């Protein structure tokens, strides 16, 4: 996301900027034959993201390809429209930039900045766990990003290391807006990733942006422990644990970290941090963040825990290898009406 150029004033301008783009989204800003597709960077439950080279500029990008028929099969039409409409409208240092979008007969395409440092996930699993200062550095960026997104009436709904990328300065970029939604009241969809679901999602109650603050508790736990607070071999066993909501902490967790996590991983919405009278400030002013200079994080002035190794603009060494598949495009348009606004 673009680098930094009162907080109430900042957020007011940010909302004006967002709403102009929300109300009149960008469409059709590239086409498939403007890019050479090189290699898959990642797949998720819905799309495939490829490293591509834009021919006329020589620039590399990360192209998310969604098969329209798969989107329909998995009941993701509205979610995918949400994803693109929101991502084209947002602007924050720790959000991946959508550079182009377009569609063809078969697929939807979201061409992002290529964030070359890899998923946080891979680094996390390899090293085992992050130190508290390292975890805190990443967590601060998510706190600020959620303050931004929630101010726009957005809920993010898929926070996990697989959807967080490390950039060339060692800062985070959030990707995968697939479950992001602009909502002023509560919402009901069962979506996310099992380990990160708040209890109120699992219990079908109706929920709001507090589920993102829960998920931040899960992320901070997982970064600092190396495993999630609620794990099992199958999702249903995870849900039981979440709803039990007893949390146990590693021996090495600081008292401050445990206290913060008890307040984020809080089943009682009247007590969950992020969800109280003082909003995000209960988190920012928590003892675990006492060392965090919030403005310096926003300005990317804090020294990063590590800068990924980068050997040229098309280097993918920080990403796992994936099986490749042909990108088919039918001579017949699929799902034209459904995706008219994309």
């Amino acid at each position: 996301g673009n680098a930094a150029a009162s907080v109430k004033e900042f957020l007011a301008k940010a909302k004006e900027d967002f709403l102009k783009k929300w109300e009149t989204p960008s469409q059709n800003t590239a086409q498939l034959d403007q890019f050479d597709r090189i290699k898959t960077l990642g797949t998720g439950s819905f799309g495939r993201v490829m490293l591509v080279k834009h021919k006329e500029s020589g620039n590399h990008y990360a192209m998310k390809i969604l098969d329209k028929q798969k989107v329909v099969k998995l009941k993701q039409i509205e979610h995918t429209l949400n994803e693109k409409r929101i991502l084209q409208a947002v602007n924050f240092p720790f959000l991946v930039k959508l550079e182009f979008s377009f569609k063809d007969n078969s697929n939807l395409y979201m061409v992002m900045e290529y964030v070359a440092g890899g998923e946080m996930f891979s680094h996390l699993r390899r090293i085992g766990r992050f130190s508290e200062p390292h975890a805190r550095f990443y967590a601060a960026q998510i706190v600020l990003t959620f303050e931004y997104l929630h101010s726009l009436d957005l809920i993010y709904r898929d926070l996990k290391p697989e959807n967080l990328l490390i950039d060339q300065q060692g800062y985070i970029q959030v990707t995968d807006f697939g479950f992001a939604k602009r909502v002023k009241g509560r919402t009901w969809t069962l979506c996310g990733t099992p380990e990160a679901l708040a209890p109120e999602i699992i219990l079908s109650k109706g929920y709001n942006k507090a589920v993102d603050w829960w998920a931040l508790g899960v992320l901070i736990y997982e970064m600092a422990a190396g495993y999630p607070p609620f794990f099992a071999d199958q999702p249903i066993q995870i849900y039981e644990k979440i709803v039990s909501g007893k949390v146990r902490f590693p021996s090495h967790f600081s008292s401050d970290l445990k206290d913060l996590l008890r307040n984020l991983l809080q089943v009682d919405l009247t007590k969950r941090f992020g969800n109280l009278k003082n909003g995000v400030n209960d988190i920012k002013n928590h003892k675990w963040f006492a060392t965090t200079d919030w403005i310096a994080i926003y300005q990317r002035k804090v020294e990063a825990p590590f800068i990924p190794k980068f050997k040229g603009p098309g280097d993918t060494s920080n990403f796992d290898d994936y099986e490749e598949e042909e990108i088919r495009v039918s001579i017949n348009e699929k799902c034209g009406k459904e995706f008219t606004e994309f």
Partner: peptide, 20 residues
């Protein structure tokens, strides 16, 4: 250990979203 139990589990790799 909790770590050993996690590592021996089936969910140490990249996790899929759930929906529907």
């Amino acid at each position: 250990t909790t770590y050993a139990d996690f590592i021996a589990s089936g969910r140490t790799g990249r996790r899929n979203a759930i929906h529907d």
